[PDB]
């Protein structure tokens, strides 16, 4: 609620405004473990819960109930993440899930179907992912059409900022949480494919952690 005390080097550097923008943090791939980092730099992040389902566990007296929550975060202009956490009560489960969802924000790569008009609108390539009997497909699409996908994954693609894509599913899609995790992996792999336009050699620069001096 009140002003936070940094625990890691990144918290102090961000609090002092010693770092320029988020893009070098993504370039250097440093782990994030403190949720004030994302919301200090990226306001107006909308979050969205799927559904809540009870989970049981037997005991001598009888049973015992736990609650599982599904939550994803995104800003509709290239940042998305999700988190999974269970607790004995909904309010705790949702709040902690929101925290981990913020911790799990990832960027997406867009592009132009066919000819280029600027205003990136579709995927550069076709990508798909599988996680334990669930496979999700993303296909580049021409400008203008709506989203062709299931109602569950339509929200995730809407919140990813992608406007046109084609989708195809296979396997046992009945596990909605697993389907969402597969979609998140498919969107996560957009920057992992080496297109010919990255053939030019890039210059290596020293990291901010090494070249900055932290406070006492």
């Amino acid at each position: 609620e009140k002003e936070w005390q940094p625990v890691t080097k990144l918290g102090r550097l961000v609090k002092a405004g010693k770092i320029k923008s988020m893009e070098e943090i993504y370039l250097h791939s440093l782990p994030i473990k403190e949720y004030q980092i994302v919301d200090y730099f990226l306001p107006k992040l909308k979050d969205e819960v799927m559904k809540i389902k009870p989970v049981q566990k037997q005991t001598r007296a009888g049973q015992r109930t736990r609650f599982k929550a599904i939550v994803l975060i995104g800003d509709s202009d290239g940042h998305v993440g999700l988190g999974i956490k269970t607790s004995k009560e909904v309010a705790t489960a949702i709040r902690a899930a929101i925290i981990i969802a913020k911790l799990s924000v990832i960027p997406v790569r867009r592009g132009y179907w066919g000819a280029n008009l600027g205003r990136p609108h579709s995927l550069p390539v076709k990508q798909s992912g599988k996680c334990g009997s669930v496979t999700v497909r993303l296909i580049p699409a021409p400008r203008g059409t709506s989203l062709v996908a299931s109602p569950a994954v339509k929200r995730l693609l809407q919140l990813a900022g992608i406007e046109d894509a084609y989708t195809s599913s296979s396997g046992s899609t009945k596990t909605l949480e697993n389907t969402l995790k597969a979609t998140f992996a498919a969107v996560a792999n957009t920057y992992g494919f080496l297109t010919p336009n990255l053939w030019k050699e890039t210059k290596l620069i020293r990291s901010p952690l090494e070249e900055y001096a932290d406070t006492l």
């Binding site: 979050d47 969205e48 559904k51 809540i52 009870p54 309010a91 949702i94 929101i98």
Partner: peptide, 21 residues
């Protein structure tokens, strides 16, 4: 069966925000 507190949560947004008659 977690449907007791959705009436006055305001701390999260559900998928099908239940419209009221």
């Amino acid at each position: 069966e977690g449907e007791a507190e959705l009436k006055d949560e305001q701390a999260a947004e559900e998928i099908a925000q239940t419209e009221k008659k």
